[model samples]
Target: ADWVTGKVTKVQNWTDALFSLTVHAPINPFTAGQFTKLGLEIDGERVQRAYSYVNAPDNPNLEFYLVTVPQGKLSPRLAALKPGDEVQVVSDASGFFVLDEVPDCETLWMLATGTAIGPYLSILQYGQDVARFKNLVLVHAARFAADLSYLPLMLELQQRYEGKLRIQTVVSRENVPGSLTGRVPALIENGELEKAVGLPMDKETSHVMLCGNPQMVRDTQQLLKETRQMTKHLRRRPGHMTAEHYW
Candidate 1:
């Protein structure tokens, strides 16, 4: 196993529970949408967790956004890291979330919730690879406005893509101004999301990628099946939907 040692350069608390870390890894080069196994020694026991890279591959330093689950094994430990702390990082990054696996489509719909937004962030950072997606729509759902960690980044990407990319945010718990106020399935069912994007979901034109809570994924997948006859993406048969679950 390849390993690279790095020091935590900075950590920003994006929200009360979510944080982003920048690590100075000079020798490692990775593709966007890939993941690294972060290993650390905790209480004399070695612990590791696979975290998706949020920083663009072209960036000199590595960055990752994560949610800290109170009393959780990895989250608490990671949250305690400070600048100049040594961290062990795996060098050989690999994952199925890369752009090459997602077939070309007119509209690429990226659906994410919570920390599952990690991989999608990588894909967005590598804008050139996914530029073929004429209409790139990012739909993110969170419990509240405070939990929406990457809103600014998504907005910047939308501006960069000009007429090509669009972003929509849904907050389930609390009310937010000018934001969708329900779960993704509800947004799709009530036609609110479609109206916001000015396009109905279709298999021929839309390729849906779902990530985040398992319940949300299942509910959204079922909705797509019932409404648009969408199927899961697979090697044997390319479907209109793809999903990944962190749990």
Candidate 2:
């Protein structure tokens, strides 16, 4: 009931299926990696969904990376929005995916697929508290190079963090010139991913965050559990792996 009206400032079309929505609104402060609800009225009913914040918490322009799920009720309507339009947004952000909940580690592995990378972008761009981790590895997997949105921003962040951050891009359906072509788990299992990043992925020294397709999340989580003996990180149990599944 406290949802606020946000003015859409810009809508960046990365591809026919991918978009980034930027809105400005008077909302409560949010932590990095948290998500807020975006709502729209359709068929006389309010339809809403949780979307992770792509922009840092301090960024006044609220940003969300999104994919238009074909024939989905909310996504297509959300994608149809244009600048100067009004959308309903929850005044308070919610989620436990923030880095503050993660245990201290030598390396933080942020593995994401599709729009799920939004939270990692928010966390990285937030630019504070990340320095505690000695190394940062960001792995982004998508069906094609076209879906690998925000490459420039990723590169910029790579340079900004210098040697602290290492990024590996994976495109599964098609092979690009320089990108590795395969699922994240296969590459990781084959040691190709670790070689590309020049970092060892171990439970003792690494904390892994998985987000995106539920299949990928599940497979990767299982692989990590079996291979690295990693356990899920929870408030009650401080273990290595953290995950978010996008329905």
Query: Which numbered prediction scores highest in TM-score against the true structure?
Result: 2
**For all candidates, what are the clash counts?**
0, 0
51-151 in candidate 2: lDDT tens per residue? 99999999999999999999999999999999999999999999888889889999999999988999999999998898789999999999999998989
- After superposition, the stretches of candidate 2 with alpha carbons farther than 4 Å from their true spots are none
lDDT of 1 by residue, 1-247 (tens): 5788989999898877889888987546777777888878888997888888887888866888889989899888888889999888888887777777788888988889888888887878777677577788888899988888888888888888877878888999988887888889989888999898777688889898888789999999999999888898888998888887777
Per-candidate Cα RMSD to the true structure, in Å, reads: 1.5, 0.9
Worst-scoring 10-residue span by lDDT in model 2: 175-184
C-alpha lDDT of residue 73 in model 1: 90
Candidate 1 achieves a global lDDT of 0.84
How does residue 111 of candidate 1 score in lDDT?
Answer: 89
Highest-lDDT candidate: 2
The Cα local distance difference test for each model comes to 0.84, 0.93
> lDDT value for candidate 2?
0.93
- Looking at model 1, residue 47 earns an lDDT score of 86
lDDT of 1 at 4: 82
True-vs-predicted CA distance for residue 244, candidate 2, Å: 0.7
* TM-scores of all predicted structures: 0.94, 0.98
